[PDB]
Amino acid sequence: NRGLYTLVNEYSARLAGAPATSTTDLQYVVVNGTDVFLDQPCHMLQEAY
């Protein structure tokens, strides 16, 4: 909801709200984000393809 010069600053830095894990069997939810390299653009635009 904040202005889009404080969202572009916050886009790549903060890992967003509860994304999935990687290289698992059943797609669990991530925690501790250790070496987690995720980019989810559908969390900002609020859309699905």
Place this chain on the structure above:
Amino acid sequence: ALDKSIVVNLTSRLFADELAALQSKIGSVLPLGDCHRLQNIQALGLGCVCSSPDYIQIMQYLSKCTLAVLEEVRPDSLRLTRMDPSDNLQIKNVYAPFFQWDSNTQLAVLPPLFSRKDSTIVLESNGFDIVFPMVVPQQLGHAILQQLLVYHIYSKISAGAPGDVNMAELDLYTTNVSFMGRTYRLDVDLRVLDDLSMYLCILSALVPRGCLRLLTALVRHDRHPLTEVFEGVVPDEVTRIDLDQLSVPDDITRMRVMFSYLQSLSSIFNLGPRLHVYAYSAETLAASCWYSPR
């Protein structure tokens, strides 16, 4: 001589409100995930397991964990101090609710079971909520629990049948705790103790069968002589149980189930993450001690 300093960095600065709440709890025993020194915020506190709580899953976790003490809270980061076995430290009494420690006592480290204002500090600069344990003297630490274990049982009988429990008789003998000549009125509005009351009552019916079945098998000339004395403490009605009404494959699974609720209930009260205070000042709240695991 040796380094014990666990610098907890933060990805973002603390709020002006969130900083001053941690400034108070600057002497405080905290569980902590790993022993190395560069860690994130997600490794400290009981928020890894407690941020819908359960009792035994935290109590068994506090034995296996690595405990540490606050020493400094700067804005951008924290700094702790790792607590070794037989290691002298300097703890401050800060825990809400206040219990008035004493010198030459044996402080034990318990899970929190009071409200979410006394236990945790909610941080929103980073999205994590650190949880402080319950550091209470050991003799008071069990009287504070064996009375609330009484309260959690009788508040389930009056939910099923309200005519059996007197509310006025209940909160006159349970909510008061007398230790060291002082009375502590506790605060109760208990989903923490729903693991014990289902383990202590599931053990409540296996013991009258389990002590007769274990006496009818152990009868011989070579009986240990003290068991002749405790052959009379068992009541009249317990010595009228017919052990033939259960099958032989059923009487095995009422021992192996029974012996596991004997030990695992006995183990969590003989857990030893305790620490021996040898100096305490009642108005400065600073106490020296030495840690002693198990």
Place this chain on the structure above:
Amino acid sequence: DKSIVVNLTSRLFADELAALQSKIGSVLPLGDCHRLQNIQALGLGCVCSRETSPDYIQIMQYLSKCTLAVLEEVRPDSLRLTRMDPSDNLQIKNVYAPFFQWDSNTQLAVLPPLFSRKDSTIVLESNGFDIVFPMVVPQQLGHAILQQLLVYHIYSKISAGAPGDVNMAELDLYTTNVSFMGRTYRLDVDNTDPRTALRVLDDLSMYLCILSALVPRGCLRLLTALVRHDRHPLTEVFEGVVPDEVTRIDLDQLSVPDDITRMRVMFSYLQSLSSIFNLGPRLHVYAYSAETLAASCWYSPR
């Protein structure tokens, strides 16, 4: 420095050198904390012999007396071991034969050989002795075998006294098999000396009938409100048939200040059962490496 050199007073051969080579880095208990030591102290089978019946309690009861040491070097004239100080950071390597996966922050304890004596016993015929090895096991199975080994010595006494009491086929599968996650394991208990396993059972019957004399009645009345009303996931041992003795204690009414004095006294006899379910020493692992099988723990006995 701390070390233990152990002589092999005769000699040793080339087959048992390769047998002692595979058993390197394993914890054995030995007799005395001297720098010099002979072969008679290192065996856990100085009490666990072949021609006599073993006593798995007394073997385990022997194990909380001894000092515990880790092998480093196997020589044809000597065995050089390193010892374990009672408050010491050290390293232990997962050599042990029923493979159970450890991790960091686990809780180890040393047990007698309870699944295969023949694996642990390697015989040194050049000196007229056999050296017997324990197994280090996390305490979730450390206790669960001692729960199972005492259930055997209850029901084996009933079946050997009169075989019409106990059906033998249900006796073998239930009293010998240890239930673990994924796997069930068969204990090596067929010809034992149960004479010190009954003294442990003769100490339960003092603590247990005290616990039956002062059950708090509010916990009894919560069972009768739970075994026939609700279907809870761990009460399903108790079916709708409640035990009849529980209902025959319901004849008195509830009293809160007379169940505080029962909850408190029952509480201090539950703290007494940690003198009868004791394991040996404890090894608090604080780091583990799964590709090398090397744990680094903290030794604290008793």
Place this chain on the structure above:
Amino acid sequence: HPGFAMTVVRTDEVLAEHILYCSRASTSMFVGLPSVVRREVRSDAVTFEI
């Protein structure tokens, strides 16, 4: 066919290889000096951390 349709939502990953451009003199770096402080002493090893 029961009397309701449904919409079905998924999430799917992609191993993407990336290109990072970064312009000249964008950042100023400050580098200190290393220091050696030991922090685990055992019977087998005396560790350090630089």
Place this chain on the structure above:
Amino acid sequence: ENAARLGRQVLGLLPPPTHRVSLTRGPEFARGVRDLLSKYAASTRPTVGSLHEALRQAPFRQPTYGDFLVYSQTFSPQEPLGTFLFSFKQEDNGSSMDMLLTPTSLFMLSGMEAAKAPQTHKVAGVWYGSGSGLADFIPNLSELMDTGEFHTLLTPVGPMVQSVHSTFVTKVTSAMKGVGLARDEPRAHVGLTLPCDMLVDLDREPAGLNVTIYASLVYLRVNQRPSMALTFFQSGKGFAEVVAMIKDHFTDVIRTKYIQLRHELYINRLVFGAVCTLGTVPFDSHPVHQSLNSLPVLVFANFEAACGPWTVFL
């Protein structure tokens, strides 16, 4: 010539000397603080010689002493240096002075028989008159032996180290952790001393670096009035065996108690004893028998003291 080679292996394996900084002179304070700071700064750099200087450090630990401040009416001036100490903390609102219970003093609070302990009653008859001044402070030596809460109040501390005994108030220093040394600078090994009357020794058996010393406080009733009893034990058998060995010692007491309490038997009466863990003794150190005005008193060398909680046994 070969002894000159050993003169290098000694002088290269010694610990580094402790720095002495003179605080009385002026230009000798400058030369002493500088050699802290010029020598610590070369124990931090990442070269090989600076890592060579960080490996010579010898971290020997020191015990943690307690400072206790006792009435002289409840602590005798004739106490052997190394007597064990029990604290007592029933009430807190005073917080003026402290009660310390030596085992020859707690023998009078119990009222146990002089035929169980023959020698230590005569010595407790000359250090204390009738046990009154010990028992003037506790109005519950009849209601803590019924309800069974006496062991919950004692916290074991450690042996005597230093006692400046005065006429009215005695100042006592103990050693809680570690080997008990005298805090004063000619440091002597003040080991723990027990009378041979109290201690009951339990013992092919292996020995470690350890033989512990336990304290059992046993409730009983003599002359149909409540009166406890306290004995000391010594065995390196592990906690599972000693609890089985203590119950053999008290078979004749459990039988003769519950006969006296056959008809009336309240729930508070059931608790019987409690076992603490007082400290360890290294094997190869035998205790030396010693007589004091005559009282047969063991003395232990290198008793390093620990502390365990009281666990009820029956």
